[PDB]
Structure 1
């Protein structure tokens, strides 16, 4: 596996997922055989005789690393190498060990974290481990970032001393718990005076590259162990090589034969489909308010918006929506005219039930119709509660596409679980670009197995999980099946409004069998199996088709007066026109209109001036 098997990492930090055996199995499958934690590394609440031998593969972490409240023996984190600390525990620390003991003080004995060599951000903390040995003689000035040394909070009293001292073969006997290889291997406070960063020896000829984050095998950028910034499957760069160089000999941007895009932290050749490309060459999730995503054939970047600008709308979890977790009955008014949603949408029963802890009143169950104007979701849609009165998602009937930028769980982009709704109600879903979808745990819900989700999925690799829904025969042998005046597949409910494709004509939206070609007062005409209404001013042809399109010249026999390519109810009778002149017609028996004699302004009725008074 050239690419590192990534895992998601928890974000609970103070919770119990069931019972002790339940907390450990959930933690097991969550971290079993993963080599990069893209989140946090809570290892809380393990107990004696369990096995944490599956932590022998964690190599990097992208957030704080909590280890708290677990009475257990060694936690074999013998391969952690860097804690990028992108998010701090308690706003300060990035490796926080707190209270690893019982009411008998037989807690966390040892912690062979030997390979840890840099914590790119945040302080550290090691409080209250009554039986913890040799994690008191380590250099918290070599590992910790040289800025946060004021927030360190080491405090420990191993007043139940039972651990030996280890082989005296490494600096100051700085030992990570036992043995000789189990002791420190530092690479910052033995480097030469003229070393840029870390090193590998003591000579001034062996400083490491300026972009390595924990030691290096060689003196070259292609020899770092962990890239401090963007990587390239190669030399750990500092910023992806731009697309166009400058060539200051001739003042014009000459392109680069090695330009690549910055996808978070990587240099890729091309941005993914669901990601906004930028002129700078950087896959992003959105762009400034002075723009909007103009589709450019799958390379859909965003240009400046001229004059009025499209109403982009920040979803939940971003910006000011941080202390909120669902659509409280205080942040619902902020979705009034949001035709799109930059972010994602959460609906949880706390909104309808009311949160005293957050001090938000319950939500008006009918206020959800404000979300009707929503047309595109950038992230995911998570629904876990809808009022029992309504029988369908009566607020997302206009939703068109779910991009899938910031997807839930690193997973499913549409989640409708634990509902009581008979018909789904998403009549306008056309594509879900990237993600997955689960609709399950709905007793009285059907029509969800008829749709062909395989078409709605943009990229390849997505998959659905639809179980626990109302059974096949409980729907089949009760009448509530797919409509007969609809496609053999792709239907969202009984009513004619919503069943995707049609086998016959359709009044714009509704699949019907036969529209008004021969009878009916508003007549229509079929084009590409979508018949559209036409003028009433044409004559109703009781024999054949009564119009040949939409415009006025498409009346088989226009019952009113015909002026060349135009027939109207009454031919113009003094309409102001172009070139600053007046168009004046008249009426006769043969029912044709021609220009009047320009003598009388009042308009003629016949030849010359005899009809109109002069």
Structure 2
């Protein structure tokens, strides 16, 4: 059914603060999580820390990194499958590395006795003394042929000592001692000819073609974890077309059991902010040869004539998957965009130049380029901005932030830590989804008066706008607008920065 989900850290081998602070995060991140949308990296956990909360993890889409841990036992006893929608050091779905103490003793017990499927990628085990029994699991079953050819992993005996495995174990396989805590094959103990996985350690009563790990039954409804699309209680390869062909009339008919395709789940309707293709699937962008003329309240599109009205990718995607901030090197690629088809990261390093990525400091004047962006299909993050300027100008004509993608999976607009006197997004009229966070902006007023409850439309959108200037401390600088504008705040002082106007007005300004 429905499982609790977490983004999943994704900053491998990096240490967040102190062994403890690092810990507090790992805990804050995965506590209660049942599915890990991104990655599961457990590193730097110490000698006597409680990683009990990991017993709730049933699946991880990306990969599982476990390296540099002194802790002794890791509770990932309930992990079932590792999709491997991403890799560590390339070609690694599960990378367990250097888990030793200066005393040569760290990780010892890895109860992953349910990890039965690793859809993609290879597993690597190297330099982890104390690791016991794990060196007995035959992965020819946990991993899939296509990779057990690139998976490096040898185990070394340690100075300590650990019991063996109960005589109930298969060909040895056992993630520890417990009770029947032995690797239970469901891929090899299968019969000559069976679709895919099996639960019958031999019988021809095996699992449905669409199932990873195993299946309580032989049907499509009785399965440990779905391999591809999860449609309600069933596992699907593709989801019910809104239109089925009719072999008799050589024409197309509508399908009652037809659903839309959102991610891996199969919805009845697409989220109000995603694009719905006539096909019947929810996407985050229309072709390079199309528009987005939302119609019956639902966004849709029609192909144009070849290259259409500018569609820039936006930091962090395709031609930018490696860049972490709009900067000189390639800001040029935003010359005449009216829509950024991704996110926008304006970071500090951009303005000071990263000598690590070989990029010259961004010319403040260049941000004027963006002054033509009208909408951002994803999220707009800004942790920096030119000094001698008090206004998010480049985004004066931004009118919509779709929030198809958000920061930390949560924020769609994030203006944090600037010295700007005000926002100035006086054109913004929509924040489709995601939360707005505006804080740490020393001398920024007016913000606490936006009535965002109108500027955006989706259940759950919050607004953490804290620690800025000071209301009862900014009225003194006359920095307000309450008089000529209206209840719906302002984006600045001037009569053109109003959110709503008293007595209809013209000139994109009011008076």
Q: TM-score, normalised by structure 1?
A: 0.82
Provide the rounded CA distance (Å) in 2 between the counterparts of 1:149 and 1:130: 23
Provide the rounded CA distance (Å) in 1 between the counterparts of 2:224 and 2:92: 24
Structure 1 SS opposite 2:369: helix
* CA shift for structure 1 position 505: 5.4
Structure 1 SS opposite 2:251: coil
Structure 1 SS opposite 2:22: helix
CA contact (8 A) 2:288 2:307 kept: no
How many pairs does the alignment contain? Answer: 511
Structure 1 SS opposite 2:284: coil
Provide the rounded CA distance (Å) in 1 between the counterparts of 2:69 and 2:441: 38
Give the unaligned 5+ runs of structure 1: 513-614
CA contact (8 A) 2:169 2:180 kept: no
Structure 1 SS opposite 2:235: coil
CA contact (8 A) 1:216 1:224 kept: yes
Provide the rounded CA distance (Å) in 1 between the counterparts of 2:168 and 2:474: 74
Provide the rounded CA distance (Å) in 2 between the counterparts of 1:172 and 1:408: 46
The aligned residue for residue 319 of structure 1 is: 318
* CA shift for structure 1 position 53: 0.5
CA contact (8 A) 1:194 1:204 kept: no
* CA shift for structure 1 position 441: 0.2
The aligned residue for residue 289 of structure 1 is: 288
Provide the rounded CA distance (Å) in 2 between the counterparts of 1:38 and 1:437: 22
* CA shift for structure 1 position 203: 4.2
The aligned residue for residue 183 of structure 1 is: 182
* CA shift for structure 1 position 370: 0.4
Deviations 1:272-301 (A, max 9, x none): 110000011010001211111112132221
Cα pair distance change 1:510/1:235, threshold 3 Å: closer
* CA shift for structure 1 position 177: 1.4
Provide the rounded CA distance (Å) in 2 between the counterparts of 1:190 and 1:391: 68
Cα pair distance change 1:367/1:183, threshold 3 Å: same
* CA shift for structure 1 position 204: 4.0
CA contact (8 A) 2:119 2:143 kept: yes
CA contact (8 A) 2:123 2:152 kept: yes
Moved runs in structure 1, 4+ residues, more than 6 A? Answer: none
* CA shift for structure 1 position 425: 0.7
The aligned residue for residue 341 of structure 1 is: 340
CA contact (8 A) 1:195 1:204 kept: no
* CA shift for structure 1 position 28: 0.6
Provide the rounded CA distance (Å) in 2 between the counterparts of 1:131 and 1:202: 31
Structure 2 SS opposite 1:253: strand
* CA shift for structure 1 position 119: 0.6
Provide the rounded CA distance (Å) in 1 between the counterparts of 2:351 and 2:24: 33
* CA shift for structure 1 position 413: 0.4
Give the unaligned 5+ runs of structure 2: none
Deviations 1:151-179 (A, max 9, x none): 12112211314001121112122221113
Q: TM-score, normalised by structure 2?
A: 0.98
Structure 1 SS opposite 2:385: coil
CA contact (8 A) 1:118 1:143 kept: yes
CA contact (8 A) 1:129 1:156 kept: yes
CA contact (8 A) 2:378 2:403 kept: yes
* CA shift for structure 1 position 359: 0.5
Structure 2 SS opposite 1:366: helix
The aligned residue for residue 473 of structure 1 is: 472
Provide the rounded CA distance (Å) in 2 between the counterparts of 1:491 and 1:271: 33
Provide the rounded CA distance (Å) in 2 between the counterparts of 1:293 and 1:286: 9
Structure 2 SS opposite 1:330: helix
CA contact (8 A) 2:80 2:114 kept: yes
* CA shift for structure 1 position 63: 0.8
CA contact (8 A) 2:185 2:201 kept: no
Cα pair distance change 1:424/1:202, threshold 3 Å: closer
CA contact (8 A) 2:482 2:489 kept: no
Structure 1 SS opposite 2:123: strand
Provide the rounded CA distance (Å) in 2 between the counterparts of 1:71 and 1:330: 42
Deviations 1:514-554 (A, max 9, x none): xxxxxxxxxxxxxxxxxxxxxxxxxxxxxxxxxxxxxxxxx
* CA shift for structure 1 position 134: 0.6
Deviations 1:52-77 (A, max 9, x none): 11011100001110000001111111
Provide the rounded CA distance (Å) in 2 between the counterparts of 1:39 and 1:223: 26
| Cα-Cα RMSD | 1.3
Larger mean CA deviation between 275-284 and 484-493 belongs to 484-493
The aligned residue for residue 6 of structure 1 is: 5
Cα pair distance change 1:466/1:78, threshold 3 Å: same
Provide the rounded CA distance (Å) in 2 between the counterparts of 1:135 and 1:476: 66
**Structure label with greater radius of gyration:** 1
* CA shift for structure 1 position 205: 2.8
Deviations 1:165-219 (A, max 9, x none): 1211121222211133222111111111111111112444311110110111111
* CA shift for structure 1 position 458: 1.3
Deviations 1:470-525 (A, max 9, x none): 1111112332121522224421221222112222353422221xxxxxxxxxxxxx
Larger mean CA deviation between 195-204 and 234-243 belongs to 195-204
Provide the rounded CA distance (Å) in 1 between the counterparts of 2:393 and 2:50: 49
Provide the rounded CA distance (Å) in 2 between the counterparts of 1:485 and 1:199: 72
Provide the rounded CA distance (Å) in 2 between the counterparts of 1:342 and 1:34: 30
Provide the rounded CA distance (Å) in 1 between the counterparts of 2:324 and 2:501: 40
Structure 2 SS opposite 1:236: strand
Provide the rounded CA distance (Å) in 2 between the counterparts of 1:221 and 1:129: 39
* CA shift for structure 1 position 434: 0.6
Structure 2 SS opposite 1:95: strand
CA contact (8 A) 2:111 2:175 kept: yes
